[PDB]
């Protein structure tokens, strides 16, 4: 409906009465200006005051803020000698807010101002004094905008013109949220305090208002100005997907952050909890958050789309290169992928059945492989997944056409048709970084080739080139295979197991090159990016060590010792053991020596220490259990 | 009403506003058309939008799904430049759905597409990417259109013309639900992972909104479309019968699983649990689905009505021959049909009181009997049930006609008078399966005649022949007598005690040829759907017996432990002896060798700790017994 | 809206009926007018009457009433020889009231006469019989007198008149509030005595209607008239900071004493409890109340503004020597500052992370630094924060203005701009006491440099004299570095520590000559405040000890006995303890060496004993734990 988004045709409803419309807001050019910004300073106050608001938050993501993004609040009436709330809201608090960079907020102008209950929410890009970026929405910024130069630069390198269109990454976010009974959710402090599940027996093994929440999801993004398209239930219990249309990826990070926040406080409204976290419960599929990643024009051009690109330029050429380009990208930063995915809770997601494993391998798919293995060759003609033929043997049952692509699931980076279906992003980590780092490694391939189109190379001789370069990432078959790592590795594939040097992988010299060659970062940006995410992830662990020490010394030995299920000095040990590995993890100054030990204990003392609580679990009766069982929160 | 089924009436009310009617809809013919299906996708748009639908998701069966059918979503309003959810469904989102084959859903036009909540459900069916049928519903159509065909090519041989007429399966399906309190549905671990009570001691040995829920049943299928005819209780408490009449098997199959589906939400609904399986209590009736199947033309000619053959015809050597056919069908597979039912939980109604033993033998009635008899002498009449006087002995007492025909239940396979009842189907499993195989076998004897006959042979030769060779597996006799199984095993009737030897009887050289002769399956897709047979029922069994384990430990030895009803080490051992059974089924590779395994440990293992557990449960306080005991469940 | 608040417009809605209007109420000498005070106590009664009031309650706040201000009933409306309830309410009775001073208020006009329940609360100023200022309105509103005094006579002695124009104190009062559970604090004695946890182990170590209660807060505030600007959360859960904006501090103080009260009344009918103590929970951020102080003329000249005053006055010597001033006020009597803050809350907040640390450090700002260094070495100009661009380093983020001046927030007193944000205020204690010593230190600077004008001083020399006999307290880095306090001690800034020294500090000898000197306290005056305040940190001290004695013997021990977690002699021992040093705190004469005594035991016994506590209660069931936990109090 757009009542609570600014934008379109609900801004352009204000922004007559000063005699401007949506189109100022569109481009983001009004911030420059300075009557501009009071006349839409005006416009938004009036539409918060009759929407029933009367405070003005500028809104934020903190650097590795996971939940989930910061605000400042400010009231937008004032009091005047006489004493009354008349409203008064200039461009100055519209543009420019208060927040510490910590060991003044600026508006985002591409992101549509939102509002919620009765306070507006309006994006902003977060930076500290000096000048260096310490959020997610400037480096995302930047990385568009050097995507955008470097496809014009290349683009026009070939004779191809695209005007005063403005390129950016069109993204879906394939959100998945799990619903637990918020009683049960209190009953649980692990999810409490890091939202994922650190203990808890699945009952058989684990080798196997609810639909009124959705349905006020619904209603809220119509309310909302969200297009959300689809909502739909998963295989794992009560886990649901949603799924919005493609979009800028600087207007579609915000979007699904602000989704997170609105799912989460509507799960609160309706007795339950919103589980973000990448795998809330050990055993069942994890949460993952697909991002449709592709290369969008402002004009509705997609690089993806070979049809759509020999029809608006008359090339057909533009889409291989592109590609391998990518793909080129994929073989040069794939670590750095593994380091956008590198989230506390995304570590229990790589290498399950659910999710692909630690191989950042592109899939580009059959029949689109052997067309740029031919034009490696030196033949290249024209990508078209032709539609076979398909009939279920059965005259009454119809006879369908499905394309020649045998699509893939066990890919990080699968091309799905149109777009790259990148799957390895994680629910709770805020897919910004994921597209902070495709748009540069996109805009590094752009610009490897454009300076080559300059150079007067042929474009056929760089895809070539590129692709004998880089066709070693390219994967086709079946990601699950326990023998693909291996494979990988010997291919030279990048592969992280370790989210702990994933995010080490980040201030690398060739990926420290890239981000000042597409001024993405500088040194001291990256190193502290670095620092903050393996921060991040070294206090996540701590936490849910912290939170195992609470439930053994507060559920789970009181429960052995009510129901006398043995002698529960293993757990006292137990207890001792992870105090300990804090006590290193305290104990050390380099951030990625902590960040490997505390992925280390995650991964296999905290394992341990939770297969011994699911053993007395198992042992225990329902009511001696304290702590909420797998089945009441999955199954209720 | 039809409201919430577009078909007949209520589709044609939306196909007149383009000019088209039901009858289009009905033949199946639009799904080949291009306009026709983008007209009918306009029309199903708007009946969904006012009927308070904004989302479309294509439904299927996978293969052994028995609860219990899945189904793919997709929102069918889009959004444009200027943002607004603006109502757009096209034909190819209509036909062609997305869902993995799995270690492309097609639109099924015979079945009707209805619709919940706010979602319509379109029926489709589900195969692999290569073609193979990874579904119900396409071998149920080839079964259908095999049947069809050989119908057809039979009445043709012998001077019979049906024109444009088409054949399929009449069937009607007595879906059988227990209804338990939900709240003791909550407390019984096994009826919610697995559906039916593994353990539970039922009072007095055994040797014997509730209205509410099943009339918001009735008001729901009048406003579903479905003409939901009869339902009623049955002998075991809380056991309530629907009988939707006969009509199209590939329809009819959809119309249960959707039944099954909207009474298990209703009965959540209204704090009550559905269980669909086929004996969810030990000691009572089980929960059978009879399958009340029949050939039947389009223009309503019955082939199991001699004197509607006879008006229809002229020719009244039509109704013994198909008979004799079917006689042979069952002499010829009546494994197959042992195969059909063989389900989880099935193998807890065969062979008791309420449902008929594992001899798959068919029951004519005595005086169709001695009719076939003299025609397999050499004597054709005409078969006429001629219904003798009763009378009470009172002239109060009316004097009634009774068809001399006294009717049996004892048989897995009776001739209901005017259809064959075959009662052996499960509940939770759909009969799906159950209708292929009976639509193939019959579609085999009727190639089998029908090549007799354009051999030049008389029909009478072929009667005698058939009937001379497999009488063997008709039985009058009462088929609950425990002389009853040897006796036709000497007889030669096909019997199999052990549903995973019925599976594994799916894969015989004569069922594969079987199959391949009449198109069903290729030898790939008749091992593929054996192979997943085995594997449900194996995984079944495994739920059940870890189910057992965290009951054993979590509910039996605590509560033993609380009461002191004596040493629990019995039940330890017994955890011990599960543990390793279910190590031996994951062991072993040969997937009938661990079905085997599996129904051993379910029929014998399992059972003996289930009498231990009641021999502890009827000692123990019900304060103590954490476990919902049968009183509780069934006598509410 | 003022409805209920006497002011402006709503004064003078009643005021107009007996001819008069709000500026009457405005200058406050209508109290000294005999007629006047008539009517204003008929309009008065009136809008009471209508309003649904009948008794007007005299109000003040008692020496050291942190919570919080104490209030005399009286009914308005009489009976006559008849017997009727006719209402009538002379100025008699709207000026003077009863109330003992123990070992006759009168109404402050200056204050709003404001109206709550049915009951009209008149703000008065409390003495005893002797004259003595038994209040701290008192003391403030001497403070002001003088402030505004020694400014007019600085001003007008260097060639600047004011006229008629009123000098006081313009202070906003960032108030923050806990709001916990109603629950939870029935479940916690200390937090129903002390307002403070005392004991409770924090989830996770340490190191890191609820909408409806602010939005009734707002709307109350609007209804009452007070100008609540921003209500939003802060960094704690559940801690709410509500900060009006600046005003006459006379007014202001009971704006924030009034706040509070009907906070802690709405939680308590919102089913929550209003925590307004400076410290509620050890481990996260302190409950401080910024009080932004500056200094204001009635027609809304600002002192800290020097563009402002180059307007006004066109001289632009007066913001140097007027911050210089200041600074030397700090200077001079930073201890008195620190003697402000000492509260029994406010011991737990100083030091922290979240509030600065002990030592009293005015922060003016780095340019402003350098300005006021060159203005010592002989170098006047004009102080003017120029804004520095501030880029984002990409085109679609707005390029915004920022200060140069780089804000700090680990200062006590630091210069926020255009106003000194004394951080170092404590949300329980009334920042009265603050506002008393700041307007006195500041007229103290003010009549010196005065006198220095009148002795023929040009301004400039008194700047440099001043400069450099102040200039050490000025600090510009990091506070919370552990190397500062002995940093300042070395440059002879004042750091207490002890918040008992502080208040000791109090009647030294050069703070009792201050106190005489600007007329704020006799020597018999000062000693009575240091007397009480020194004793209602004791006492405070006292029952947060005794609540710990029943929280032991009633919670800690039974707990620990039922969870069988070892031995509790050890909490036996700390009982004695704590006892015997209450019985050392009630056993010594001398109010300073009581204090610090109760300090001691607060700090480092009381803090032992609940280490203790946490550590028991870590391996406590959370139903044996009968206290209600952080998690409870702080997630909900």
Partial sequence: FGSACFKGAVADKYLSKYGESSTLLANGKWTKDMAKADIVAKAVLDWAVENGASVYCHWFQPM????????????????????????????????????????????????????????????????????????????????????????????????????????????????????????????????????????????????????????????????????????????????????????????????????????????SEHGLAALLQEKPFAGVNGSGKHNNWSIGTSDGLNLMNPKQVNAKTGNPEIFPLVMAAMVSAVDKHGDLMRAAIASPGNDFRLGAMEAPPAVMSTYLGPSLTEFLNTVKNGSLGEYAPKKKPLEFGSDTLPSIEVPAEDRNRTSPFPYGGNRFEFRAAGSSQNVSLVNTVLNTIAAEAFKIVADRLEAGEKPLAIAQDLLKTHDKCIFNGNGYDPAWPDEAVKRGIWRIDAGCDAINELDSAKNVTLFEGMGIFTAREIQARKSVLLGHYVGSVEMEALTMIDMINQHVIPSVKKADLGNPSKLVDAVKTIKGAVAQIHGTEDEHKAATLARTLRLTTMVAIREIIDEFESRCPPEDWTLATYSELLFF
């Fill in 64 to 267: 590795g803020s996971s939940g989930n993004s910061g605000q400042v609040h400010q009231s937008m009436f004032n009091f005047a000698e006489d004493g009354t709330p008349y409203y008064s809201f200039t461009g100055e608090q519209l543009l420019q807010g208060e927040t510490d960079g910590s060991s003044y907020l600026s508006i985002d102008p591409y992101s549509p101002i939102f509002l919620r209950e009765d306070t507006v929410f309006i994006p902003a890009a977060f930076v500290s004094y000096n000048g260096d970026a310490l959020d997610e929405k400037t480096p995302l910024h930047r990385a568009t905008d050097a995507l955008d130069k470097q496809t014009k630069r290349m683009l026009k390198a070939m004779k191809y013109d695209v005007g005063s269109a403005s390129v950016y990454a069109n993204i879906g976010l394939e959100q998945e949220i799990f619903l637990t009974p918020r009683h049960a959710f209190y009953r649980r402090p692990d999810l409490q305090f890091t939202g994922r599940t650190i203990t808890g027996k699945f009952p058989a093994r684990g080798q196997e208002g609810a639909f009124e929440c959705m349905r006020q999801i619904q209603q809220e993004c119509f309310k909302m100005g969200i297009p959300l398209k689809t909502r739909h239930r998963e295989v794992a219990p009560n886990q649901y997907e949603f799924a919005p249309m493609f979009g800028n990826a600087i207007s579609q990070v915000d979007q699904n952050l602000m989704i997170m926040q609105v799912i989460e406080e509507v799960a």
